[PDB]
């Protein structure tokens, strides 16, 4: 199976206080491993996974400095983006930064990304080649021109195609027990009839990782979405993930509806009918 | 590992 490392950073401005709330978190695939919180007592990068605890003072002092700076970088950006957009200092605004890399089965680089949104709309995103920039607003254009003049694209393509991948590998290995295990979905159906006219069949999937998954309903063996509910895939807090999907069926046709499960942990796709 | 280059103001 494939893998990614990604860092998510979030700066929200609290009017009347020149110090915003900063929250940075590091994922390797669907597994959190580090976090920073401008509010928390420590003001150091904190570990979350076991395997990242075996890094030494060098690692933490450095990751603490970098992410403190990411925060101070955002502190300013809010200052700027008010001018650039002409908005009130009375308003609380949001900057979000997300970067990381992908790798195939082979652990060889596949894709890098570095994206930025002001108030949860795209601002400036790095194109796939990692040499170009996509700006929407002329505010982004003014960034683009300043970021080309500090060779940012070049500067990141180094991290993303290089460092990002060199440490994703380090993590994947150093943390094999955590990260390279693939927990398969425990599946079943429930049948609660809503009347004597209809029946609701619910295809369940529990205690699985990674969070990627696909549940699909087939009436006489054809993909149905017409009467199909399908919940957002959700955590449990033990590091596994859950999802269900249901169809409403004319009672006496339960056996014509089958559920199709797909996951990395699954050797073959599962088929479910009513029992 | 966090980025230690690429990150500046806008």
């Amino acid at each position: 199976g494939s893998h990614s490392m990604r860092y998510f950073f979030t700066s929200v401005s609290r009017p009347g206080r020149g110090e915003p709330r900063f929250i940075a978190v590091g994922y390797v695939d669907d597994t959190q491993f580090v976090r920073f919180d401008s509010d928390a007592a420590s003001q150091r990068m904190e570990p979350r996974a076991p395997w990242i605890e075996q890094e030494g003072p060098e690692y933490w002092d450095g990751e603490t400095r970098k992410v403190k700076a990411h925060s101070q970088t955002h502190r300013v950006d809010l200052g700027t983006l008010r001018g650039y957009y002409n908005q009130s200092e009375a308003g609380s605004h949001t900057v979000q930064r997300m970067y990381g890399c992908d790798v195939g089965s082979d652990w060889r680089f596949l894709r890098g990304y570095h994206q930025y949104a002001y108030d949860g709309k795209d601002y400036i995103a790095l194109k796939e080649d990692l040499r170009s920039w996509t700006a929407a607003d002329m505010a982004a254009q003014t960034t683009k021109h300043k970021w080309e003049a500090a060779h940012v694209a070049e500067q990141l393509r180094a991290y993303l195609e290089g460092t990002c991948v060199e440490w994703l590998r380090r993590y994947l290995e150093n943390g094999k027990e955590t990260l390279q295990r693939t927990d398969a979905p425990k599946t079943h159906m429930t049948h609660h009839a809503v009347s004597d006219h209809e029946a609701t069949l619910r295809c369940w999937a529990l205690s699985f990782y990674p969070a990627e998954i696909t549940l699909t309903w087939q009436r006489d063996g054809e993909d149905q979405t017409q009467d199909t509910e399908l919940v957002e895939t959700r955590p449990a807090g033990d590091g596994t993930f859950q999802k269900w999907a249901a169809v409403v069926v004319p009672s006496g046709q339960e056996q014509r509806y089958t559920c199709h499960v797909q996951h990395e942990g699954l050797p073959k796709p599962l088929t479910l009918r009513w029992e | 590992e966090a980025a230690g280059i690429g990150i500046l103001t806008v």
Partner: T-cell receptor, first 106, second 116 residues
């Protein structure tokens, strides 16, 4: 202090020959590398900075990085004697080595 | 304005004396730092702002307090002066940490001698 290790001179080259200055850093996953030039009695001065494997060319100065071997270097092709001064090596504009005192003897 | 500034340029001191070195830069530099350099050794980091109000300790922080009111100033103070502190102190700012292009300008340095 191991953080960043330098030649630790004095090094002495003849005029018009290439100077090679060498640096290794302890903290792996440093990603910025800077070369500073301090004349005796004066203050450090950024001359070169590399963030990416290979050779970066700036006139007579070339700077070299091998993130494999945790190594940074500096070529001064065609040394003049006004080049003679302490050269300081630095990771993420934060920690510096002792410095390598270069004497380009004319 | 003139990159980065320092006061004084040269200072004698009696062991066990209060003393502050000034540092200033009108460039909007969030990152700043303080170094000591002894003839022979090189730059050893004492403290560093990554921004206003944020300060961290470096490699040789003993003897030496620091402060970070305002983006502009980054003072350095010796509470009880010692010969062990007789050195050349440089103060450096860059627009950006976590970014290579932007230069790290150095002050003219303060040359400090402390005598019993």
């Amino acid at each position: 202090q191991k953080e960043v290790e330098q030649n630790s001179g004095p090094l002495s080259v003849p005029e018009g020959a290439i100077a090679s200055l060498n640096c290794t850093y302890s903290d792996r996953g440093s990603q910025s590398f800077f070369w500073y030039r301090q004349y005796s009695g004066k203050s450090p001065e950024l001359i070169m900075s590399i963030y990416s494997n290979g050779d970066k060319e700036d006139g007579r100065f070339t700077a070299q990085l091998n993130k494999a071997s945790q190594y940074v270097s500096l070529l001064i092709r065609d040394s003049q004697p006004s080049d003679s001064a302490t050269y300081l090596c630095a990771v993420q504009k934060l920690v510096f080595g002792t410095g390598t005192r270069l004497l380009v003897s004319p | 304005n003139a990159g980065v500034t320092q006061t004084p340029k040269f200072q004698v001191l009696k062991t066990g004396q209060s003393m502050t070195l000034q540092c200033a830069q009108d460039m909007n530099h969030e990152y700043m730092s303080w170094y000591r350099q002894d003839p022979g050794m090189g730059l050893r980091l004492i403290h560093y702002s990554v921004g206003a109000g944020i300060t961290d300790q470096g490699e040789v922080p003993n003897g030496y307090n620091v402060s970070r009111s305002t983006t502009e100033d980054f003072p350095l103070r010796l509470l009880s002066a010692a010969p062990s502190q007789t050195s050349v102190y440089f103060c450096a700012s860059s627009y950006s940490f976590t970014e290579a292009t932007y230069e790290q300008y150095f002050g003219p340095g303060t040359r400090l001698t402390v005598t019993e």
